Design a protein around this ligand. Structure first.
Ligand SMILES: Nc1ncnc2c1ncn2[C@@H]1O[C@H](COP(=O)(O)OC(=O)[C@@H](N)Cc2c[nH]c3ccccc23)[C@@H](O)[C@H]1O
Ligand SMILES: Nc1ncnc2c1ncn2[C@@H]1O[C@H](COP(=O)(O)OC(=O)[C@@H](N)Cc2c[nH]c3ccccc23)[C@@H](O)[C@H]1O
Lengths: 361, 363
């Protein structure tokens, strides 16, 4: 409908209207019955972010469920751009991907775009982008995925994605690249080629693909669906989440560009405290999105704050408690993840199959 | 000065003035001094295409000899785009690279751009280029390179060049790509990226690179030289050859687009006969002998005078040309069959090939 905010795979500016964005991008709203269809098919309760509609939009999700119950299955694909340390917003797609692999028992491909973040950022060198890649793996593997149904790879290392991208790189016209991603005459040739690389993992299997991500990554999936059939694959399915807002603002997105308003997965308990205490509804947004896994306590405390039974200080003390408990658990797992990197990258069942794409010798 | 002919890495149209092309591309002429300088260091006589100045232009070639003389050495790189069968023009760069590897004893990297040819040709599929890749390898191995100092790879297979291309894929902005290669809004994104892939093999070693090829491939190299030092490498050296003309026409070059005027490395003796005999056509007849076929300088000059002065009939000259083409092709096709066994060595098992493939992470 209206134009005053920006949502690209690299920028999110201004107050985001998710209802308009659903039409701007042409994505289907994740209906109430589609959520209940998953609950009855997996025979379990949906996680916090699904039932509270943090994931608001979808593409061919009804097709994914139809494929599963008819026994032809599917596979999961999500990714991460290692431009620096990860925050709470970056990890939610992976938690959604964890639950989906858990309940449906499907393969998972995780793309670490260390090539992208070198190409798209001037400050960063290719060397330190590979550094953050490893650091980011640790956080991702700390979520807990099936060691035999998951493949985590870097584009610079598992360079087979280049060969996997060439088909679509011949399909994607350059005029339409500039149109979808806003490339200009001043973009780098590596920048212009990259969309082929991010689309490539959808062709890991002949089965249909599901991509749990935030709405900002959608432009890639539109182009995929434009040429999927002519390349002999299914039009990729997607589940789109909203954005985790920053502390001070509601007119943007939690970004590492503003470290003061972002809680990193690697943040200390003192860092959490200092960031929340220091300023001044955002407080309950985070609890609704990720941190309070109880609906009754969420509902009761919100109205206890809205009407004024709870003081502001006691209210954000409760936020700190929740995000401190999660970070303590995550950082503990990070240390345990260090000795599982080889499994998810090389040694594991899926990882071994994929790496057996090196010429027989 | 003048541009009423087109020379891009994908098309050559019209009669080509090689003198102006040196100015247009900013290359430097291969001086008579440099030819004799190489003969001293190599301690031998120069090949037909070198001494008869078929290779006419160069870049930093004086710096490639200085490095060898001062004991720090260099390395060779050339390539081939597998769109179909290879003709006689395609193989000359490889013969030059053979001689340079022989006399200088350096490493050789051969890039088979089966990715380029799929992207740039609408009619070709990725499988087409992959199988034409194998076919072309046989012809390239048939030339005879050091089995331990040569690596022949395919961009779709040795996908390591993608990681080798990223650094310069961030340097070369899109405005530059259009200006150098003539890309338009109708180009495919894979086309626009590709120059990074063809430049990448110049970063195989820290030593400086020499590229023996025809002048049409030069746009890639002058773009490599713009960013080589900022990426921590030497700006690549090059040796540029002229084009082998087609049978009938004096404009353009020998191309697979017109198979009837091209001598393919796979052509039978009767194919050569029919192609030469069939058309009325005479500079071309002796151009080929000057640049590739007649290894004797004294015999070459003698028959040129005997032809132009009318002492020998054209029928004798065409018969003389055919016999020399047939001698080469009989010998090449013989070595081509023996080449089928050496493929695994040049691609994987060989000393250099094994070193490069050890970029499959420790597992
Ligand atoms: N503030 C936020 N709130 C909620 N979710 C957010 C927030 N910020 C980011 N996300 C989602 O987190 C994932 C990683 O973001 P990246 O920017 O690294 O995402 C990137 O840099 C990609 N180019 C890397 C990539 C490659 N393949 C993929 C497939 C799916 C998703 C991502 C990828 C993404 O799912 C993103 O949608
Ligand atoms: N009519 C002719 N007369 C004499 N030489 C000719 C003639 N036509 C072509 N050549 C030379 O043959 C080699 C391969 O040609 P391609 O078109 O496959 O060339 C191609 O398609 C490249 N994209 C493949 C490539 C990748 N890296 C390289 C490095 C050097 C040279 C070539 C490459 C080239 O040396 C070319 O200069």
């Amino acid at each position: 409908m209206v134009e005053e905010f920006k949502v690209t795979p690299w920028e999110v500016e201004g107050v985001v209207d998710y209802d308009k964005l659903i039409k701007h991008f042409g994505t289907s709203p994740l209906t109430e019955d589609l959520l209940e269809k998953t609950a009855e098919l997996t025979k379990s309760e949906l996680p916090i972010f699904f039932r509270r509609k943090f994931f608001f939009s979808h593409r061919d999700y009804d097709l994914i469920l139809k494929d599963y119950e008819e026994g032809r299955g599917f596979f999961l694909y999500t990714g991460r751009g290692p431009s620096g340390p990860m925050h709470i917003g970056h990890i939610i797609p992976f938690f959604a991907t964890k639950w989906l692999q858990e309940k449906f028992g499907v393969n998972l491909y995780i793309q670490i775009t260390d090539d992208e973040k070198f190409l798209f950022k001037e400050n960063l060198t290719f060397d330190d982008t590979k550094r953050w890649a490893y650091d980011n793996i640790l956080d991702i593997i700390a979520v807990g995925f099936d060691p035999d149904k998951t493949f985590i790879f870097q584009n610079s290392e598992f360079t087979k994605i280049y060969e996997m991208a060439i088909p679509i790189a011949k399909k994607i016209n350059f005029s339409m690249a500039k149109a979808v991603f806003g490339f200009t005459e001043q973009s780098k040739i590596g920048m212009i080629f990259f969309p082929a690389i991010q689309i490539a993992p959808t062709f890991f299997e002949r089965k249909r693909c599901l991509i749990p991500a935030a709405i900002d990554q959608d432009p890639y999936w539109r182009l995929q669906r434009d040429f999927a059939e002519s390349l002999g694959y299914y039009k990729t399915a997607a589940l789109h989440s909203k954005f985790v807002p920053s502390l001070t603002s509601l007119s943007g997105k939690m970004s590492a560009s503003k470290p003061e308003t972002a809680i990193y997965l690697t943040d200390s308990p003192e860092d959490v405290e200092k960031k929340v205490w220091k300023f001044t509804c955002v407080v309950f947004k985070w609890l609704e999105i990720f941190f309070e896994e109880d609906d009754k306590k969420l509902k009761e405390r919100y109205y206890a704050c809205k009407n004024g039974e709870l003081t502001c200080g006691e209210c954000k003390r409760y936020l700190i408690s929740k995000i401190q408990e999660f970070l303590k658990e995550h950082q503990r797992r990070r240390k345990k993840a260090e000795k599982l990197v080889e499994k998810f990258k090389y040694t594991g069942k899926l990882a071994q199959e994929m790496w057996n794409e090196a010429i027989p010798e």
